[PDB]
Amino acid sequence: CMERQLEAARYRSDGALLLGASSLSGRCWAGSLWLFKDPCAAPNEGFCSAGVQTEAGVADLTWVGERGILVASDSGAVELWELDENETLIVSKFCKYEHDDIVSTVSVLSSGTQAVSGSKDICIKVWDLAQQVVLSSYRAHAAQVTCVAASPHKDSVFLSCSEDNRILLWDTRCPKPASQIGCSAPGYLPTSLAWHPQQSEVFVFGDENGTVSLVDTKSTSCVLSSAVHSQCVTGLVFSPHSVPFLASLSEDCSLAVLDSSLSELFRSQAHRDFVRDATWSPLNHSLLTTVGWDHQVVHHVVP
């Protein structure tokens, strides 16, 4: 058996699909992790590679190399799940209760040995995945942390956004590591963060009003934005393409793929509930897989 609300969906380098799921209604509010070597077989339980039950629901997920699965739990724990030698089992490596509320977001840093977590307890923490301990604990924000996104190549740099209407650039080499950015005036609350894969110092942020914005930390100005979605932008993911496409996820229950100038190229009304996560296939870069609370795993073809 599996839970209705699909939260996470991430492709591994070899093209295997990692799903995260939560029960957000009914008797038991638990969670589960699944691996699918056949991505078309998903979300069917009987035709999965490996599966395991978690104590509580998964709010966010991410890979830790090839065999590691880092989980943001409702329990307030950040837990790392080791993959079996033969990839038939998913076993708990550690489960550490360091947050005082739901862990909402996690992001592995460039090195791959350290991670950063954001929680509704307002605190952001930096983890050592080897020692299984919290190196640093930061209370920069004044409200629940919505998204944290590690820089692709810099292990001391990452982004964070919260309901205190702050977008903070972090550099852990500074005694005051956080730096406030955002568009000129206090805009609508930031909900999603994605670093540009190639262009350093360039990221995109979505707000609760459905607007997706392109921002440059060097210029620290609101250079470009577009009213993409009719509701909150919950996820932003860049494609592996040389000139990468930007897939934007929303609670309006629609996928929208955008160019470098945030113009609408493709859109899908396939989902009939909230669209939670999206991941591009490394085998077929044109193929994009989205998951939602309707328990659908839709495989798109982007021109």
């Binding site: 509010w29 638990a30 509580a56 209760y97 005082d100 930061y138 209370r139 920069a140 702050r166 609508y188």
Partner: protein
């Protein structure tokens, strides 16, 4: 010991969770009634038509469990005061849904957060829900003692924490609550859940919450330090705050995860128990008074009304009070009768308002202690109490005591009195009309006669209590002025309140009053300097009295007679609360008015703003002659 609760935001299954917190020793559980992350759409399709169920079943627990053990929590995504219209309208519908499900489950309390300045729409929805069927359920507004913005780590390079002092700015969290409860029209169903952080603010910020209806105190696991052994503990300043809240008799909510992994989680709770258990037991006074804490009673009128037998019983159960009266009389007899005249000179001693004769017994003890002769009269107009005196007189006292069943202003005495002993004082000294009574009895006092007491003075202090203001407001009765309850005093053991300035003297009376032109009417203007931001809800009333020379009784907090509980303080409320900010002086005017038939008080605030004159022509309150 403490009444504790557990706060969780993660409940995999309610049965196993509730069982776990029970073993830990928690009396109730705070939890979501819908999964916190399970955001729901009410307007826009297709999310609108999401298949159910929308949450877990009400069949999972018994009706008793829902009514007693479960406190609901508003889902954190619900933002009725969002700047986005879509999020507003959806959060309105979401809020009503969760509140209505709480009402369906019959929950004793429901938690809603205040973590910003503008909660106007939140208030509008809650007020509408409150006024949709008469229910018992409480609403605990979760308010931080210090705003997270003012508690954050100074780690933002281009947005540093303001190191400059802002007196009013540091109280902003109280203004969030004050504005909210004002918008909801001081609803008795809306209380405070005060959340305490790792770093406590200035005392004035904490004292702001004195008089506020605090039902819960939320303690995160973060704020707890670690001793040498590894057990969780709190700082001396945190311990101070716990002991202040244990007096207010609030419920304690533990929130956050177990950071002290080595030891069991119950350790957090076991520490709170240790604090409360290692406290001086109530013993004398404290327990009797504890039951009466902030209990509004009409002031007794022993002149107009005949007091019940059990009312005299509590008057009589005050050994310190009668020890003083005995000492006052003991001293007086030695002053009036020289040693050589002890057998010749026999003093005429009249107890005016003898009740069941505790002052009569005090007089006899004082006489044989002083080794002086006395002839006792026991004057009492209450003919039911006269039954007690005359049975005393026949069985024990004898001819020595002469019981007189009449009013002391009417009674024609056969001889004049050397000493008159009276007990005719209320909580505001003269509010039982001791002056008018002793004035009427003064003609049968000897030219050089002594009155015990010889002097009494009333005291007033401005107070803040949103709690007591609401209790007065709830005393509205049919078939009278809707605001009559605000224009009369109450005798109350003041508990959850805030003294805004030191008590100053109001009205003084001397006995005997040999003045040719006797006028017991008074007009007094008092200037109360206030050195805090607060809200004026009324004036606490006390009294002091000189029995004889240095022998005194007092219910004035500063000079209060140790272990004396014959009198609780009096409360003079006002119709409208008055804002008083740091530095401003509260100016109150008090009149003692009278005609031939009635005596009453009028009162008015004149600064920093004027109130209405309260109880004009004694329309709401009169003391019968």
């Amino acid at each position: 010991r403490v009444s504790s609760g557990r706060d969780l935001n993660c409940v995999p299954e309610i049965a196993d969770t509730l069982g776990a917190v029970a073993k830990q020793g928690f009396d109730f559980l705070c939890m979501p009634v819908f999964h916190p992350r399970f955001k729901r759409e009410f307007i826009q399709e297709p999310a609108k038509n999401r298949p159910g169920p929308q949450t877990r079943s009400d069949l999972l627990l018994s009706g008793r469990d829902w009514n007693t053990l479960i406190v609901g929590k508003l889902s954190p995504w619900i933002r009725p005061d969002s700047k986005v219209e879509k999020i507003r309208r959806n959060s309105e519908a979401a809020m009503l849904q969760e509140l209505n499900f709480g009402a369906y489950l019959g929950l004793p309390a429901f938690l809603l957060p205040l973590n910003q300045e503008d909660n106007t729409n939140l208030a509008r929805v809650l007020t509408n829900h409150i006024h949709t069927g008469h229910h018992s359920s409480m609403f605990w507004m979760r308010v931080p003692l210090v705003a997270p913005e003012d508690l954050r780590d100074d780690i933002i390079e281009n947005a540093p924490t303001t190191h400059t002092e802002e007196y009013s700015g540091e109280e902003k969290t109280w203004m969030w609550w004050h504005n909210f409860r004002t918008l909801c029209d001081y609803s008795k169903r809306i209380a405070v859940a005060l959340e305490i952080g790792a770093d406590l603010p200035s005392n004035h910020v904490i004292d702001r919450w004195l008089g506020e209806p605090i039902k819960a105190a939320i303690l995160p696991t973060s704020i707890f330090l670690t001793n040498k052994k590894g057990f969780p503990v709190l700082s001396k300043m945190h311990q101070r705050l716990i002991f202040r809240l244990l007096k207010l008799e609030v419920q304690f909510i533990i929130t956050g995860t177990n950071h002290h992994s080595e030891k069991e989680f119950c350790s957090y709770l076991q520490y709170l128990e240790y604090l409360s258990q290692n406290r001086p037991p109530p013993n004398a006074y404290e327990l009797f008074a504890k039951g009466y804490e902030d209990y509004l009673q009409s002031p007794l009128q022993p002149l107009m009304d005949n007091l019940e037998s059990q009312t005299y019983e509590v008057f009589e159960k005050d050994p310190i009070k009668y020890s003083q009266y005995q000492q006052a009389i003991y001293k007086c007899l030695l002053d009036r009768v020289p040693e050589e005249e002890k057998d010749t000179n026999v003093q005429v001693l009249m107890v005016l308002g003898a009740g069941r004769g505790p002052l009569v017994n005090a007089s006899l003890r004082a006489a044989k202690q002083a080794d002086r002769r006395i002839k006792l009269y026991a004057v009492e107009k209450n003919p039911n109490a006269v039954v007690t005196l005359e049975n005393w007189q026949f069985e024990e006292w004898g001819s020595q005591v002469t019981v007189v069943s009449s009013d002391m202003r009417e009674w024609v005495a056969p001889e004049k009195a050397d000493i008159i002993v009276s007990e005719l004082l209320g909580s505001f000294a003269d509010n039982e009309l001791s002056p008018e009574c002793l004035d009427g009895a003064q003609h049968f006092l000897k030219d050089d006669g002594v009155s015990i007491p010889g002097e009494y003075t009333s005291f007033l202090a401005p107070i803040s209590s949103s709690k007591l203001y609401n209790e007065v407001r709830a005393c509205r009765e049919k078939d009278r002025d809707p605001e009559a309850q605000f224009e009369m005093p109450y005798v109350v053991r003041l508990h959850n309140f805030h003294q805004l300035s030191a008590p100053q003297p109001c009205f003084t009376f001397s006995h005997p009053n040999r003045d040719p032109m006797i006028d017991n009417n008074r007009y007094c203007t008092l200037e109360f300097p206030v050195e805090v931001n607060t809200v004026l809800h009324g004036f606490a009333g006390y009294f002091e009295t000189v029995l004889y020379q240095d022998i005194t009784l007092s219910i004035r907090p500063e000079t209060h007679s140790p272990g004396m509980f014959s009198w609780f303080p009096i409360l003079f409320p006002i119709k409208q609360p008055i804002t008083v900010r740091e530095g401003q002086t509260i100016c109150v005017r008090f009149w003692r008015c009278s005609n031939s038939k009635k005596v009453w008080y009028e009162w008015a605030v004149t600064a920093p703003v004027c109130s209405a004159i309260h109880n004009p022509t004694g329309r709401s309150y009169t003391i019968g002659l």
